Design a protein around this ligand. Structure first.
Ligand SMILES: [Zn+2]
Ligand SMILES: [Zn+2]
Ligand SMILES: [Zn+2]
Length: 601
């Protein structure tokens, strides 16, 4: 178990000051905060926990207020006494998801420095795919110990308690164990993180410095016009009604716009061919093939998409606005992807359609406050630029070197014709090939995205590898070391472990071969992006210009910049991104500005 004996509950200044003194000479210490809510900007600190050594940890309750809650040190007094320590860059702290913690402190004008070790990130850099990187999963894996779960002390469902309603001693068992367990996890993982200079570098210079930048980006939030969102909502109801009428009008009677039920009984029953089309999907979409001549499938296609988008963003978004800030604060996840790229949720900015008009309207709702503008800094096909570098191809490298559209250069060489004459269908065939390589796409998969016959696709790829031989080598070389060492790495050292590389299973090992070729390019993009955020954020913190970094999505960073400052700030973001990262990959940053995210994008 864990009883009231394990950890102390600090209820008086004299004891806190005693701990503070010990904390000041500890080589590194684990620190934690407990709040009344998951919402960072509006949560109130209910208490703090520390651990100076395994088994030696304490819980400092400051704001429990249930009926008859014992006297506690006031939140204001505990913070003023703890502030010097917390803001000391020299006092090294350890924690699980320090991002959340740094933010809560910032609610009180305290700047958490010495953000040295985050056990979540230690775990993530050691092996991103080992499993879940949360403390409960970690403790069970490295310490064969099952931690006290939040549900165990608070409950479940709607009648779940908030931390401030939990008895002091129960609150302490949970809090103090978090502190203690975190320290123990660091003591086991930190040594391991040193057997390799690759992972080490990434964790030290990329992941750790990013913890406070993510916090600031999350807390800053993004201004969303709910009116716009609402109009778009009303209009999408009218358009969904019209499309339903247009579907009924093409044939007869009423029916749902669901395949393998109401569509097949119409579509093929009135000529076409039997099978359906899955919503597997991004490889064979029977519905959009007919769409070139057939009208009905076209309207069902465009219908579903609009219905998805409406409930996903148009209806969801306005409800995410925070009463306290009046802005939306998305959740970025640093230890979730296998390759190392930041993911996002509530909302998942990365699922907002790009090459589609309706997604563009979603983006128009992402607006700049009065006297400011949204500025978009993007890494133009950074992953393609990464592949050129990693494959040491003079062709590709030169295409970018002289500012040429790699898709048209590629086709100009693959199809053998002048660059100014390359057709849209050729540029489109080249691009399908270019992008297929990154994802390690099969010659048949390429045939499925391009709609050409098999072996016709195999013809194109053969021509590609002969004109760009350095790419075949890279591809093979990567599938080689991936089998040998069981992992692949990015330019900075980040690793992706491939456990099924020698699987003995067919498709499971194929997946591992695709991930192998892919990860090095994606992971490197991720590293480049993280390094850029740190760099730009460092300029922001030091120089304090009139700019806020508000989003990170795909290969772009989004800001709000003062309208009178646009030019000088844009020159700067441009230099920080294409120069203060990796000087080995030929990078290009496209900077745009507007009144909303769509205008700058
Ligand atoms: Zn915590
Ligand atoms: Zn905790
Ligand atoms: Zn893998």
């Amino acid at each position: 178990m864990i009883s009231y004996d394990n950890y102390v509950t600090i209820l008086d200044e004299e004891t806190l000051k005693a701990w503070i003194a010990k904390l000041e000479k500890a080589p590194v210490f684990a620190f934690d905060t407990e709040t009344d809510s998951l919402d960072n900007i509006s949560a109130n600190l209910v208490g703090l926990s520390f651990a100076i050594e395994p088994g030696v940890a304490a819980y400092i309750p400051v704001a429990h207020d249930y009926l008859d809650a014992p006297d506690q040190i006031s939140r204001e007094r505990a913070l003023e006494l703890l502030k010097p320590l917390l803001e000391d860059e020299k006092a090294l702290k350890v924690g699980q998801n320090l991002k959340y913690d740094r933010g809560i402190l910032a609610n009180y004008g305290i700047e958490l420095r010495g953000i040295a070790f985050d056990t979540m990130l230690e775990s993530y850099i050691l092996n991103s795919v080992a499993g879940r990187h949360d403390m409960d999963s970690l403790a069970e894996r490295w310490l064969k110990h099952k931690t006290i779960t939040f549900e165990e002390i608070a409950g479940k469902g709607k009648n779940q308690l908030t931390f401030n309603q939990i008895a002091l001693e129960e609150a302490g068992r949970y809090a103090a164990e978090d502190a203690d367990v975190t320290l123990q996890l660091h003591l086991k993982m930190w040594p391991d993180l040193q057997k390799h200079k690759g992972p080490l570098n990434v964790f030290e210079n990329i992941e750790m410095p990013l913890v406070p930048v993510l916090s600031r980006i999350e807390r800053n939030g993004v201004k969303i016009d709910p009116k716009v969102l609402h109009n778009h909502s009303e209009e999408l109801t009218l358009r969904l009604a019209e499309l339903e009428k247009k579907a009924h009008e093409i044939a007869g009677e009423e029916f749902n716009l669901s395949s393998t039920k109401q569509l097949q009984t119409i579509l093929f029953e009135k000529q076409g061919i039997k099978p359906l089309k899955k919503t597997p999907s991004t490889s064979e979409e029977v519905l959009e093939e007919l769409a070139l001549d057939y009208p009905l499938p076209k309207v069902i296609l465009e219908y579903r998409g609009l219905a998805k988008l409406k409930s996903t963003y148009t209806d969801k978004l306005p409800l995410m606005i925070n009463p306290k800030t009046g802005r939306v604060h998305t959740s970025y996840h640093q230890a979730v992807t296998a390759t190392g790229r930041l993911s996002s949720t509530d909302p998942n900015l990365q699922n907002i359609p790009v090459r589609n008009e309706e997604g563009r309207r979603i983006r128009q709702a992402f607006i700049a406050p009065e006297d400011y503008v949204i500025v978009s800094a993007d890494y133009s096909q950074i992953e393609l630029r990464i592949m050129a570098h990693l494959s040491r191809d003079k062709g590709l490298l030169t295409a970018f070197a002289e500012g040429k559209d790699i898709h048209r250069a590629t086709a100009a060489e693959v199809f053998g014709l002048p660059l100014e004459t390359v057709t849209s269908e050729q540029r489109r065939s080249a691009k399908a090939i270019n992008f297929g390589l990154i994802y390690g796409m099969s010659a048949f998969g390429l045939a499925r995205q391009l709609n050409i016959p098999r072996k016709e696709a195999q013809k194109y790829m053969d021509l590609y590898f002969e004109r760009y031989p350095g790419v075949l080598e890279y591809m093979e070389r990567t599938r080689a070391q991936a089998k040998e060492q069981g992992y692949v790495e990015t330019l900075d050292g980040r690793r992706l472990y491939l456990p099924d590389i020698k699987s003995s299973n067919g498709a499971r090992r194929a997946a591992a071969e695709r991930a192998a070729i892919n990860a090095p390019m994606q992971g490197t993009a991720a590293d480049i992006i993280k390094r850029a955020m740190i760099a730009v954020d460092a300029w922001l913190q030091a120089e304090q210009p009139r700019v806020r970094m508000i989003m990170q999505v795909h290969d772009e960073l989004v800001f709000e910049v003062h309208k009178d400052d646009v030019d000088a700030v844009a020159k700067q973001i441009h230099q920080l991104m294409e120069n203060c990262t990796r000087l080995d990959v030929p990078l290009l940053v496209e900077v745009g500005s507007g009144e909303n995210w769509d205008q700058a994008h």
